[PDB]
Amino acid sequence: MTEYKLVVVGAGGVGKSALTIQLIQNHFVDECDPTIEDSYRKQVVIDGETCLLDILDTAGQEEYSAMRDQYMRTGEGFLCVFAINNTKSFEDIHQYREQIKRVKDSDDVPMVLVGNKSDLAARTVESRQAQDLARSYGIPYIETSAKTRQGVEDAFYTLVREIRQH
């Protein structure tokens, strides 16, 4: 196959486990579980191409370590997720982006910025500001809900399109 190796990164509670379980299994979860399953794999068709996604769902309240580096370094593209009702998570995006670049030892990594939990009202992270963030880094910005499935495909499939183009 062409495999696409995706790593989903970002802060505690942002919806990384849920976004991926929604893509790999087509259902929504809700369960305070810091465990991280082996990689999620799924043959899919993206823009007509049959391919294997292999998605590493990582941990949110974890400091950088060699162990985390050991897991992350195999990824080809990175989904950088915050929650639109969590300002800390959006600000932490800078760290996560900078961490990814250092781990991959590269000035140009395929990434997509994802603002998750779009179904929730009274958002705190202004949409325009995430677009400006994503723009200033030169990456796509997708808004998602692991709950309603809005954007879950756009977000991930765009990340595959960024791998192809790098």
Ligand SMILES: C[C@H](OP(=O)(O)OP(=O)(O)OP(=O)(O)OC[C@H]1O[C@@H](n2cnc3c(=O)[nH]c(N)nc32)[C@H](O)[C@@H]1O)c1ccccc1[N+](=O)[O-]
């Ligand atoms: C330890 C773990 O930290 P974590 O594993 O780093 O956290 P995740 O980023 O994987 O977070 P998860 O996907 O489990 O989603 C967190 C909570 O928000 C809910 N959620 C996820 N996406 C959405 C969405 O789009 N909309 C709505 N309305 N809700 C959503 C989930 O059902 C869950 O209750 C963790 C940290 C903080 C909080 C929870 C948590 N957890 O395990 O559940």
Ligand SMILES: *CC(=O)N(C)CCN(C)c1ccc([N+](=O)[O-])c2nonc12
């Ligand atoms: C599901 C879960 O998070 N736990 C079992 C850990 C204990 N709890 C309930 C916990 C830990 C940490 C934080 N936090 O610092 O954000 C919590 N906030 O609400 N419950 C928390």
Ligand SMILES: [Mg+2]
């Ligand atoms: Mg999780």
